[PDB]
């Protein structure tokens, strides 16, 4: 093998089509399916798998009571074949911790898991299924990372980490890893003011990440990373189309070097594909809660403060619950461009459905196409009454 | 392939980090998970797996009633992928018997299982998944072995066996195996007086084993084995820090060539890493029962009778149940030194929780690091009431 090099551009996105769907909650009503949260999709040279953080229990078990919590000793990063449910019997554990990220570099997979108490957390970096290196907490307030696929170029895999208050300034850093070891690190620069949970994709131009601003903005920070130079810059998406959740109603004019105000101390992980005219933004439909999901084609959204959608597609109806979303790609696929893909977490149970004591999710995943294809909502649909 | 040679030293241990955790009891509340005891971890050239002795039944089955017993026809040595539970469907049986040991020699795995009645037991030595050789009982009183990973050097794998009273003198022997066949054997020598359940690790200097003294001592025997010469010596750890369970309170001065008195006819399997200043001892926190677990950095513990801890780490709180512990290593890992690792059995159910009729365990495993990382207790946590 050889390391994956980002040499191709993105394929024109005219519409999105179904790539995968596990139906985990629906199947789990009467089978040995694990309770998970914060899913992502990531591909190796010959296989795509679903990744998620497990709660160490099945949906119908009694230890599912209280799975609403985010951090515990029982959490681990697992992976399973794409479109199969996260079962007890077909899942593989990659590493242990309550926050994680992973990516294949063209030779072997790297993964990072974060574990420990809120004021003494640490990250363990694994490569080729063995521990390689560790990073201890520096701000002593929830060390956390991307919860998505990382992108490598010629063996170098930048990873974004944050440690600090989620309701104020925090120490955001980028570490550049190669074969699990750290080559370089940088403090966050540019004009973004608060960064969490970055969704990254690569192209021949570098690595682009869309992140959450949980402190002030309804717009999203963007980190632009050059993996060869191992340098970066940052800004917000200029477009007036707001993408976080909760958010205020869309303005006529957006902001580029400052968060758009209206809803403080909250937000949801999400993504965008920024490519001039070929620019798509994902977001929820509700502005008050994490429900629905749609894709909007908003030309030059990164730089045009007055841009509005010219095309779009509904992924999830606002009648149905949504969740965290993010980007991924098959960097080993045949063709002269990369096919952009994304996933959406569909959250069921707590905190919205109080008839049950568990929280869990299903995964829906879609990829771009150059055809203008018909659309269909892809809801979860498990009937909650069957679990009562 | 080629045989593994012990050519590297140990890596400096400044702190320990989570390596694996199966959550077997927690998952097993409502899934097809086997009842096991006496776990260990062992690695092949490209994979680490959990090993344990199965009772031939699931946790929620009715045959789990009475699993408190140690020796029966139903016991077998099984292995499954690291950090997955010991399920019915993903486990592989290595061999049959109520006592066992195993290790990979760099070309193929060797395993030994002991079966038979208390007064007519025998060991069957398997290699590359086929029977190769057998050893019959010599003292006619529970032939038993290590219950951990064995260590091979250039194809030679010393194995420690004991046959005789557990409350008095016993015939302790070391057999040296190559490709499942016996090359040499020795009677135990040196100053240790009683040896059971040795936890062994290797280094460039030879093979070091820390064992249990179930007859008299609160300190532990150490066997130092030279796999090239196929010779050995023995002594006790000099340190005043006592490591068995139950134990008397720690003295100011320890003993080196004699067991430290106070608690007769009892004890627990455990381990230590002995490396001059880079010396760590594992032990329970309670002195009366098998609860809690901690690691102490006690410089020169093997030879300094007045040494005391200068650093330490809590693995399990004393509020939670613990169990047998032991050492393991990845002898095929990249780097210029070996990363020390260990595991702790977390015992649930009988004999302490009499609300249930079963006994079972979960596995927690940790590895060393050169960083000073934050600590967190790693309890089992299955709620016993869910099984009632």
């Amino acid at each position, epitope marked *: 093998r050889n390391f994956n090099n980002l040499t191709k551009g993105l394929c024109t996105i005219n519409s999105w089509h179904i790539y995968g769907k596990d139906n985990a909650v629906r199947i789990g009503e009467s089978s040995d399916v694990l309770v998970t949260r914060e899913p992502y999709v990531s591909c190796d040279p010959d296989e795509c798998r679903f990744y998620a953080l497990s709660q160490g229990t099945t949906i119908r078990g009694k230890h599912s009571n209280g799975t609403i919590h985010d951090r515990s000793q029982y959490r681990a990063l697992i992976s399973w074949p794409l479109s199969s449910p996260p079962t007890v019997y077909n899942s593989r554990v990659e590493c242990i911790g309550w926050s994680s990220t992973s990516c294949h570099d063209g030779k072997s997979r790297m993964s990072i898991c974060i574990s420990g108490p809120n004021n003494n957390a640490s990250a363990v970096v694994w490569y080729n299924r063995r521990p390689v290196a560790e990073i201890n907490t*520096w701000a002593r307030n929830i060390l956390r990372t991307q919860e998505s696929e990382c992108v490598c170029h010629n063996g170098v895999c930048p990873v974004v980490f944050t440690d600090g208050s989620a309701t104020g300034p925090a120490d955001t850093r980028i570490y550049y890893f190669k074969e699990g070891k750290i080559l370089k*690190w940088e*403090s966050l620069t540019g004009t973004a003011k608060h960064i969490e949970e970055c969704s990254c994709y690569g192209e021949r131009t570098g690595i682009t990440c869309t992140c959450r601003d949980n402190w002030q903005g309804s717009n999203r920070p963007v980190i632009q990373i050059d993996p060869v130079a191992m340098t970066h810059t940052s800004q917000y998406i200029c477009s007036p189309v707001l993408t976080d959740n909760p958010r205020p109603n869309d303005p006529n004019i957006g902001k580029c070097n400052d968060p758009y105000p209206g809803n403080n101390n909250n937000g949801v992980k999400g993504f965008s594909y920024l490519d001039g005219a070929n620019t798509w933004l994902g977001r929820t439909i509700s502005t008050a809660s994490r429900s629905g999901y749609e894709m909007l084609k908003v030309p030059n959204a990164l730089t045009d403060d007055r841009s509005k959608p010219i095309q779009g597609q509904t992924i999830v109806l606002n009648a149905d619950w949504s969740g965290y979303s993010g980007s991924f790609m098959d960097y080993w696929a045949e063709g002269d461009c990369y096919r952009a893909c994304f996933y959406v977490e569909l959250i069921r149970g707590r905190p919205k459905e109080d008839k049950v004591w568990w929280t869990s999710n299903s995964i829906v995943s879609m990829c771009s196409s150059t055809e203008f294809l018909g659309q269909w909502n892809w809801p979860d649909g498990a009937k909650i009454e069957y679990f009562l | 392939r080629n045989f593994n040679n012990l050519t590297k030293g140990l890596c400096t241990i400044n702190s320990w980090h989570i390596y694996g955790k199966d959550n077997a009891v927690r998952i097993g509340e409502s899934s097809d998970v086997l009842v096991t005891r006496e776990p260990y971890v062992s690695c092949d050239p490209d994979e680490c797996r959990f090993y344990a002795l199965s009772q031939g039944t699931t946790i929620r089955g009715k045959h789990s009633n009475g699993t408190i017993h140690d020796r029966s026809q139903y016991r077998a040595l099984i292995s499954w992928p690291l950090s997955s539970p010991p399920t019915v469907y993903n486990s592989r049986v290595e061999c049959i018997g109520w006592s066992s040991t195993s290790c990979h020699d760099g070309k193929s795995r060797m395993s030994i299982c002991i079966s038979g009645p208390n007064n007519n037991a025998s060991a069957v030595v398997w290699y590359n998944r086929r029977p190769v050789a057998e050893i019959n009982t010599w003292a006619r009183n529970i032939l038993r072995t290590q219950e951990s990973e064995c260590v091979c050097h250039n194809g030679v794998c010393p194995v420690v066996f004991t046959d005789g009273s557990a409350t008095g003198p016993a015939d302790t022997r070391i057999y040296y195996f190559k490709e499942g066949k016996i090359l040499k054997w020795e009677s135990l020598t040196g100053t240790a007086k009683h040896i059971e359940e040795c936890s062994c690790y290797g280094e460039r200097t030879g093979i070091t084993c820390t064992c249990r003294d179930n007859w008299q001592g609160s300190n532990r025997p150490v066997i130092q084995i030279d796999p090239v010469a196929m010779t050995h010596t023995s002594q006790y750890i000099c340190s005043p820090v006592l490591t068995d369970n139950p134990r008397p309170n720690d003295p100011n001065i320890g003993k080196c060539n004699d067991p430290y008195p106070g608690n007769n006819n009892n004890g627990v399997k455990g381990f230590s890493y002995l490396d001059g200043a880079n010396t760590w001892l594992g032990r329970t926190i309670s002195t009366a029962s098998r609860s809690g677990y901690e690691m102490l950095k006690v410089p020169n513990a093997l030879t300094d009778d007045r040494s005391k801890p200068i650093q330490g780490q809590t693995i399990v709180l004393n509020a939670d149940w613990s169990g047998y512990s032991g050492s393991f290593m990845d002898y095929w890992a990249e780097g210029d030194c070996y990363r020390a690792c260990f595991y702790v059995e977390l015992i649930r159910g009988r004999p302490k929780e009499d609300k249930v009729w079963w006994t079972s365990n979960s596995i927690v495993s940790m590895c060393s690091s050169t*960083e*000073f990382l934050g600590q967190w207790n790693w309890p089992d946590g299955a709620k016993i009431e869910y099984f009632l």
Partner: nanobody
Amino acid sequence: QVQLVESGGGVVQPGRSLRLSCAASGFTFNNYGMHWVRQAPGKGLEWVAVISYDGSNKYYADSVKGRFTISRDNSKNTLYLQMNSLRAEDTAVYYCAKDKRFITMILVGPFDYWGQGTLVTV
């Protein structure tokens, strides 16, 4: 090659403060932690303080604890020592030194490179 250049020395009447600094070059400042060491004339070396590569961990010798502050500005490749309430016992040549270890939180030395030192008289 690696150079560390001390400045800010001088004479401080007792009870007054003084701020020292070192200009670092020839290596990436951000990859190594740094130490201050002082030597009173006619005496051996005394360790004063250490700071981690990202400024997150700061430790002091008991003899200056509560009086001295160590800090670093990674954008200027500059190490600082803020000495408050100086006493006659603090007269010494103060030196900067570079910790040999790369991007680690293990503040153990060795001191790979030393500067030339600057004298503080109290």
